[PDB]
Ligand binder design. Structure first.
Ligand SMILES: NC(=O)c1ccc[n+]([C@@H]2O[C@H](COP(=O)([O-])OP(=O)(O)OC[C@H]3O[C@@H](n4cnc5c(N)ncnc54)[C@H](OP(=O)(O)O)[C@@H]3O)[C@@H](O)[C@H]2O)c1
Ligand SMILES: NC(=O)c1ccc[n+]([C@@H]2O[C@H](COP(=O)([O-])OP(=O)(O)OC[C@H]3O[C@@H](n4cnc5c(N)ncnc54)[C@H](OP(=O)(O)O)[C@@H]3O)[C@@H](O)[C@H]2O)c1
Ligand SMILES: NC(=O)c1ccc[n+]([C@@H]2O[C@H](COP(=O)([O-])OP(=O)(O)OC[C@H]3O[C@@H](n4cnc5c(N)ncnc54)[C@H](OP(=O)(O)O)[C@@H]3O)[C@@H](O)[C@H]2O)c1
Ligand SMILES: NC(=O)c1ccc[n+]([C@@H]2O[C@H](COP(=O)([O-])OP(=O)(O)OC[C@H]3O[C@@H](n4cnc5c(N)ncnc54)[C@H](OP(=O)(O)O)[C@@H]3O)[C@@H](O)[C@H]2O)c1
Lengths: 330, 343, 331, 343
């Protein structure tokens, strides 16, 4: 029988996760919890200003029908203690609200049938896994973190380039689309930079790169750091790695080491663009990272710059469900 | 009054004491406007923002630029002519007390008490008047230059919407010149904090959609609003709004059927004439072929686009006018505070 | 029964759209394209669009293009219309999409040998003008025609429908329009000092000859309708806004019904209705000349109504281009 | 000199006479900058725009706001300290004659003569010096505050790119403090007039794509540019640019490997220290947590983002800095004109 999952929270990642899971034959969405009215949640699933239209229907009994999940229960309960996925016999939760990004909080989902919780974000005191990077070290933990979108795109490249060349140090900048933690106009915010209109401004913003890499590539954590700059695009982001290696490198050798890993250890996770595309071309791309082959450069013997695209919504949502598949069986 | 005397203030020569409630877009702009009026003193601001964030947001604006503002050793703000602004942070209107700073008039800018019943909760001790920065249930409504002269000491009023402040003066002028039989109004409007940055939950499933990516039709009670300030015209006018991807500055589009015949010439004349007389400082004319960004921080309720006036079939005209939905409206707010404090 | 052999002149926005539309029409064969772009660049642009998405397109060994049902597209690169010879691929009809030959005199230069018919992707001086579903049945074998502007294609249907139902006494049009390649990215030289200003930052009023356009296709209504455009910071999809005075009384209900009805009958596949409260980005790539916004129809007094309608100013119009190519090849 | 005397000008006390060639973004900004320098006189502008359009574009800017400019009865422009600007409209550089107005120095802002050979065609009679508003083949290159003191009377010079004016000072300061071993540079850059509004033909198939919708990686010759102004560092630095949907204001991102050990503290100290001394008026520090729009019209070649400096692994640092790619660069252009007119 398909793996029975429930989606908690229907903002950006919630909506993407639904749409991704709906296209996986080996998955069944049995429930969704949404603070949106039912009709609104349907509307939002169907119609996206960035990703386009999607086929979704309502059954007479007021369940949703989307691709291979034909009987989705819809719930609307903010309080996690009253929320009961058991009712639909959910095995695994993808937690997408942003309000329970900790081990303590998200454990509350574990009840009758519910045995596993994947958090759509970094999470306090929470074992953290990134498909293709350290996911094979999964050992039946009941509550995990799928990390940030930026780690899913950065950690692969770091692994690959470390295994090929040994990373001594690296600096990361992510040029990131604006997300719902930002403001439409200049108003109150706990961060006085993200207070400012997202669509008008370049907005530097601190992001815990060292800590993130520590969880999934511990030997590299103390050697890598960086930051983010939020920019006026609605989706699709760009990671910019500046790396110092132990072994000498060239444009050619870095290119080769990346292409090779896309054929082997990172098939379906990392890709290469040779066609000189731009951000909008990666809307809805399933990859954790698409390397920008023609812009790879080196300087001196040991240093290189590597760029890669990632759809911070869909790429990550693909990985969410990939990981659901993976931990349902292992 | 003893608190006035203790601070060396003479109540008889005193500037008009106002407090600003809410420090979002309109609160912020109202602060900036009032700070530059010599006859006004902002004596208190209530803000859910951290103090230092409030300061920051006053000082720096992605659209409007930089503003001089300081913080005094005692945690009061110092901006222009308002050197001792008490800052509060109390969401509960019943616990909030602007009497402490001897506020006469409240500029209500939260968007949460847009009703006679709700905003009346402000009235205590020194506080006698309340101007709501939006349309408001069961609330006497005034628009500067349209019907503000009918004001008769009401203790809680509404300053209408930004669109009504732009549309009503135009409607009045053109009605008095040509008699409006009917009119349809579209406002092409900058996006506001009423909207969403990305596609997510909202009670209106249009405004649920990403504000910076979409044209977004949206219903707005034109007939009702006009009824309040120009009652004869209320039954004759209606319209809607389209939110578009600009952060500020909006455009009102009037398509009018008149009783008397018109030309482009005669419509231009009637509008310019009114800008010199009954609407000096409220309505203006643009003859310089400007675009939306040129009107950032314009003080006018409306700026007519003189070259794009068109008429057809003897009786019909299209009239466009710019307005800075934030600063023009805020200018009127404080104009109204000056007005109701004295008259 | 062999497919109608067409060539596309110019590969900017409409050119690219027209290629992609025609490529999906079984009854059409694109035999040639003329492009000032390098071949590889034209291919790149056909394949990848920041608004409309990816498109399957290939290059054959011989350096022809292969796209859907047009498998051998000759690719030319000649700017001078006199030296350009579409006869070499046996083209019957030209879709003129450069913007540089929008007149009878100029575009006539395409007529040689196999080439008998020219559809201009824009208004055109002294040029018989036709709008699918509006006056296209009055086509009488003219060899050079105009497919009007994108705004006329969206406005004229609505005007016809509402006229036939209620008798239009007067109407005023505003189109809230996406920016197009006649605008500037930043504040710089332009013959129109409003379109000189940065397109992505500004609301930009701009003069559009509505009366004249409607005169060509709905002559009785030309002297009764006029309006203007406001260019706005969106890359595609526009919005027409009609304020109408009628002879016969109307209601929200009656205007709605008259419009729904015409979508089922005289304007099937040309006009549509949205009842789902969508917004602009939802109509990206929509094939319709006009999608009425049902819920926002309003009336005031007895005789007056406002009507809004969406239109993808690129694709909607490009659909109509090829519709008209089909229509004049046979009639 | 006879034309000077006829107009009541004393050649021995006169302001430095410059002419501006091309009135796109940098031309326009250069006009506004120079107009406000008392030691400068703009004596001529050559513009492909219609005169009245040029005036309009000087006066009104969607990003930079409004500017005072007048047209004199005789068809000369009158802006700040430059009251009799001759306006020309001649695309052919060999027919253009800035001698007519007794220009000493040409600011070359068309983007079409970025080479020693091409721009030399300016040199006739009174015109002795040419500053190219871009990198330029076979052209001595100078960046104010980096190597401008090596200037030795060259008649044609390049003011480098906007990115080199921001990057080079930072590289110099940090090199002199810590020795740069290597560095990688990304510039997140506002879109410019070499890009497309919509997806259409371009020589670079990335810049072919809509500027307002896309992040657009783009190759920029960093090593070559640094080589010219800081030769020891040329072989040690490289990088690229990413064009993004903002109309103005850009961000340079340096990732540096040093010989001496560093901390956030020590990098901050070295940068601030330089801003007080060797780079007063050229480099600055932002301690106020600002964003891109706050630096519109900033005069500095670079503004360091003090709070976002990071270091790791003893030797490595990230350093960000804002720059207004239009006004910062334009400020330097005219600083250089002042400099080479005298030294
Ligand atoms: N690119 C990305 O978006 C991205 C990538 C990776 C990770 N993440 C992470 O994903 C999390 C969510 O981000 P997002 O992009 O999806 O933001 P979002 O669009 O704001 O999604 C959060 C949604 O959760 C809803 N919600 C909050 N509390 C709820 C509850 N108790 N029950 C049900 N729904 C609830 C909110 O609705 P209300 O308004 O009703 O509260 C909101 O619509 C964050 O931790 C973020 O860091 C995001
Ligand atoms: N163009 C315009 O923007 C415009 C023009 C004319 C009229 N108006 C109207 O004026 C009103 C204000 O709009 P706006 O654009 O300024 O909205 P806004 O930017 O969202 O500002 C509203 C602010 O009020 C605060 N607030 C809410 N409840 C509060 C309370 N109890 N005490 C103190 N502060 C509170 C909110 O802070 P929290 O987020 O912490 O709750 C928010 O920062 C609305 O009704 C609007 O329609 C707007
Ligand atoms: N929404 C719309 O875009 C829309 C809708 C309806 C009608 N139209 C009309 O369609 C026409 C074109 O609009 P558009 O948006 O497609 O224009 P565009 O995006 O500017 O593209 C026009 C193209 O024509 C090319 N061109 C010019 N002269 C040529 C020649 N002699 N041979 C071959 N190619 C040539 C140009 O190439 P170069 O760059 O090499 O000069 C350019 O790429 C205009 O009249 C416009 O009004 C547009
Ligand atoms: N932030 C920046 O934009 C920036 C910063 C530093 C350096 N630069 C460099 O400075 C140069 C100018 O850039 P920009 O942004 O100002 O570009 P721009 O906006 O395209 O300005 C160049 C102007 O020169 C005009 N022109 C072309 N040939 C001419 C001629 N023969 N005579 C007179 N005018 C002529 C063009 O008008 P027509 O359309 O009539 O040809 C155009 O308006 C470029 O090389 C650029 O890379 C730019």
């Amino acid at each position: 029988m398909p793996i029975r999952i429930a989606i908690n929270g229907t903002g950006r990642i919630g909506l993407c996760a639904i749409r991704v899971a709906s296209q996986r034959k080996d998955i069944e969405i049995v429930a969704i919890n949404s603070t949106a009215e039912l009709e609104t949640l349907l509307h939002l699933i169907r119609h996206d200003s960035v990703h386009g239209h999607f086929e979704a229907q309502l059954n007479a009994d007021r369940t949703l029908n989307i691709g291979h999940s034909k009987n989705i229960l819809v719930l609307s309960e903010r309080d996690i203690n009253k929320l009961d996925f058991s009712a639909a016999n959910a095995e695994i939760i993808i937690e997408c609200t942003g309000k329970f990004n900790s081990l303590e909080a998200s454990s509350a989902h574990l009840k009758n049938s519910v045995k596993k919780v994947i958090i759509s974000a970094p999470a306090q005191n929470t074992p953290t896994f990134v498909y293709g990077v350290n996911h094979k070290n999964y050992h039946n933990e009941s509550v995990i973190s799928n990390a940030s979108c930026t780690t899913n795109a950065s950690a692969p490249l770091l692994k690959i380039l470390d295994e090929a060349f040994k990373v001594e140090n690296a600096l990361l900048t992510t040029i990131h689309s604006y997300t719902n933690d930002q403001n439409l106009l200049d108003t109150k915010h706990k961060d006085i930079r993200r207070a400012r209109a997202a669509g008008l401004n370049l907005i530097p913003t601190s992001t815990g790169v060292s800590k993130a890499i520590s969880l999934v590539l511990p030997h590299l954590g103390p050697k890598v750091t960086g930051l983010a700059i939020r920019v006026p695009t609605p989706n699709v982001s760009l990671v910019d790695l500046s790396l110092n290696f132990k072994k000498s490198v060239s444009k050619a050798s870095v290119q080769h080491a990346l292409k090779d890993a896309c054929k082997h250890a990172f098939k379906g996770v990392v890709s290469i663009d040779e066609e000189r595309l731009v951000s909008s071309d990666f809307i809805s791309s399933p990859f954790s990272a698409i390397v920008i082959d023609d812009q790879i450069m080196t300087i001196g013997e040991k240093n290189a710059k590597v760029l890669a695209w990632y759809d911070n919504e869909m790429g990550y949502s693909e990985r969410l469900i990939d990981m659901a598949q993976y931990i349902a069986q292992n």
